[PDB]
Nucleic acid binder design. Structure first.
Lengths: 48, 135, 49, 50
DNA sequence: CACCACCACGCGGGCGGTAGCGTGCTTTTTTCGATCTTCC
DNA sequence: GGAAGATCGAAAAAAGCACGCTACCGCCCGCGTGGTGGTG
RNA sequence: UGGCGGUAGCGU
């Protein structure tokens, strides 16, 4: 849940680090890229 | 004894990686086709690669090691099937150099049909993987 | 604070806890050395089914 | 006794073994091993005894 | 009005490099190749 | 009478390293490309 | 309207 990994405001226009959010973002990026590659009928090396 | 490898060069430094690889006496290839695409004004010669961050290289590992290529500016890494970089014979780059307007020809017609850049280089790797399976 | 989410993975991925925490649960269950296990998981060798 | 234990019997074999210890996984090459050995301790750009 | 400057931005991930980086603790578990043994 | 079983020594990997409190600073993408706005 | 890291100090 987001409240357990909050994005607190820094009172300067930016936010915190939230390493959990960064790792989730990386996982989502990889999953979306893999889905797009599968939908494109990729060769073995690229999907691997 | 000579090996053709495929490099996933760094994002935005295709030309820089090209000149750096050419400086190290390494034969580098970037497939070139303009497709007469439409710039903001009208249709002109854009002259864009198949899709960026992709290069072909020819180099014998005995003379120049793969670590030097990995450390070359503008290039990130190779593509390795299993645990070793993919080996590529000369048929694909002969066909690529000769035809710059059979099954590879139909692939090129596909490239001229879709112009979706990711799809153009995607079918390019599809053809090269088909030949690798043939080899 | 309590509502959870989920991501549908395009391809299955091995759980690191059940793979790398010695003794390996997957390796013990499959009666196969761990080296084969994470050389197959990370796309370096083929395994017959 | 160390020489008897030592499996290498030539300069090239020793260089290849050193390269394998230094960089596991990479393919041991004559030029790469020689360059690594030269740059380990006999190069001013990498080794500096003040 | 196609050319420069400002801000979204996108995917990208280790970075910067034409390679390495590491360098003053102790205990427990795995494991893996090498060695000796013994019987089917 | 030469390969599985047992041993075994070395190499690697993982786990741990008292409690409570006070004060300060440094930092909390990125980068380098491209879409788009300003312009000689 | 929080976290991480470093530094120094106090009581044991």
């Amino acid at each position: 849940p987001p409240d357990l990994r909050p994005l607190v405001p820094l009172d300067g226009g930016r936010f915190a680090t939230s390493d959990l959010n960064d790792l989730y973002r990386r996982v989502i990026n990889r999953n979306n890229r893999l889905k797009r590659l599968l939908d494109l009928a990729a060769p073995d090396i690229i999907v691997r | 004894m000579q090996s053709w490898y495929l490099l996933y060069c760094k994002r935005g430094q295709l030309q820089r990686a090209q000149e750096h690889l050419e400086r190290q006496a390494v034969n580098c290839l970037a497939p070139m086709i303009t497709l007469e695409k439409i710039v903001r004004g009208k249709r002109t010669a854009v002259s864009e690669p198949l899709c960026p961050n992709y290069l072909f290289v020819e180099f014998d590992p005995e003379v120049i090691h793969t670590t030097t290529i990995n450390a070359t500016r503008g290039v990130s890494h190779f593509v390795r099937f299993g645990a070793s970089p993919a080996i590529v014979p000369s048929a694909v780059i002969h066909q690529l150099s000769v035809y710059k307007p059979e099954g590879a020809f139909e692939g090129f017609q596909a490239i001229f049909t879709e112009p979706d850049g990711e799809a153009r280089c995607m079918l390019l790797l599809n053809l090269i993987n088909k030949e690798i399976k043939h080899s | 604070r309590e509502r959870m989410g989920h991501i549908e993975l395009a391809s299955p991925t091995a759980h690191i806890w059940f793979l790398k925490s010695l003794p390996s649960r997957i390796g013990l269950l499959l009666d196969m050395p761990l080296r084969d296990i994470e050389r197959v998981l990370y796309f370096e060798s083929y395994v017959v089914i | 006794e160390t020489l008897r234990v030592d499996p290498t019997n030539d300069r090239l074999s020793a260089l290849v073994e050193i390269y394998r210890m230094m960089r596991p996984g990479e393919p041991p090459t004559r030029e790469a091993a020689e360059s690594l050995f030269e740059n380990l301790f006999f190069s001013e750009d990498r080794y500096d005894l003040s």
